[PDB]
């Protein structure tokens, strides 16, 4: 046993494949401040060829990649694949506490029909639906934290759907930079004895905050000057948030949008409630419950966002409260029909 086992799960058989090895090199540098006697950093790495599950171990001042298991080319967002990875990882390395990092593409709660989080383009375009992710997580231990190193995952719908899987969720409600986490300082925070979720957030944010330029001048995949936005949700507080939401309900251009250059699927949850609320008592209580659930947040004044074309620009994060939501537009669309049927948040927060 160790004190903690953290699995970094890299579904990188997709456009992001070029970032994976670099993050691995960062992770290896981060193990220098970590005592591997009690702490297990595991990495499942799929860049397209033959995936591997390793553990990083220190000899002296050198970190060595011990191979736990190797795999044929496989769909890393298939439920039984992820389950097998999980079962193996946490069986070989039990611990007193557990963490996990989901590294891939992401698009919140949105439905995707396989021939959502994570993409594998190895044999067709495969993506994981959040109910499928919740099923895979069911064979896993309960986590102290989940870090989504993936776009748009800090959604109240996603976190509520997965609330029984972890104590804390770390992510961005908007797009996450290509380079993702600075794992040279996030890795020791993954094993912080006190408040790892906050530690992870502070260390993640701080590197991007320091090379931030307001116009994203000189931004590149090798040098991200476009900033970042991050928050931490405490899952044990979501039920009260849902209950506080229902009470508010008993009484769009102006709400901050996290994908303003694309489909406008994502808006700031607090911004939504401020504009819908018809009673200060109900609302001032909602803000308290909101404060209890969203315990950490920070953003640079702008973030870089992209159009569907792939091009992009800096967008103002004015109004940022750290969590996104879907605003029902009543349009009979397929994603709303899915929302009203399979997103628990819809019935939990009483969106009637």
């Amino acid at each position: 046993y160790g004190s903690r086992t953290v699995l970094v799960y890299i579904a990188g058989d997709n456009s992001l494949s070029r970032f994976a090895s670099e993050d691995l090199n960062e992770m290896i540098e981060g193990m220098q401040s970590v005592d591997d006697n009690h702490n297990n950093l595991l990495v499942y790495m799929d860049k397209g060829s033959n995936p591997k599950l390793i553990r990083l171990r220190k000899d002296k001042d050198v970190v060595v990649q011990d191979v736990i298991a190797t795999y044929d080319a496989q769909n890393s967002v298939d439920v039984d694949v992820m389950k097998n990875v999980f079962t193996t990882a946490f069986s070989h390395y039990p611990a007193d506490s557990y963490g996990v990092v989901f590294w891939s593409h992401g698009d919140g709660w949105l439905p995707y029909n396989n021939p959502w989080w994570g993409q594998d383009t190895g044999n067709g375009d495969n993506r994981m639906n959040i109910p499928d992710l919740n099923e895979a997580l069911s064979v896993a231990p309960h986590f102290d934290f989940i870090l989504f190193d993936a776009c748009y995952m800090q959604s109240v719908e996603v976190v509520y759907q997965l609330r029984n899987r972890a104590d804390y969720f770390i992510g961005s409600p908007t797009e996450i930079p290509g380079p993702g986490a600075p794992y040279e300082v996030v890795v020791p925070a993954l094993f912080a004895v006190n408040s790892p979720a906050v530690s992870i957030a502070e260390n993640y944010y701080s590197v991007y905050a320091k090379k931030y330029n307001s116009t994203g001048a000189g931004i590149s995949n090798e040098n991200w000057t476009g900033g970042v936005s991050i928050s931490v949700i405490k899952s044990s507080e979501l039920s009260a948030l849902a209950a506080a939401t229902r009470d508010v309900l008993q009484t769009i251009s102006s709400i901050l949008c996290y994908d303003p250059l694309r489909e406008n699927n994502y808006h700031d949850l607090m911004g939504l409630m401020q504009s819908i609320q018809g009673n200060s008592q109900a609302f001032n209580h909602y803000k308290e419950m909101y404060k209890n659930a969203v315990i950490w947040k920070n953003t640079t004044d702008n973030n870089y966002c992209t159009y569907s074309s792939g091009y992009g620009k800096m967008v103002s994060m004015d109004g940022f409260e750290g969590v996104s939501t879907y605003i029902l537009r009543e349009n009979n669309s397929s994603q709303e029909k899915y929302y009203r049927q399979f997103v628990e948040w819809y019935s939990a927060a009483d969106w009637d």
């Binding site: 992401g106 476009g226 992009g312």
Partner: peptide, 4 residues
């Protein structure tokens, strides 16, 4: 430049 890419995002995730």
């Amino acid at each position: 430049v890419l995002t995730x």
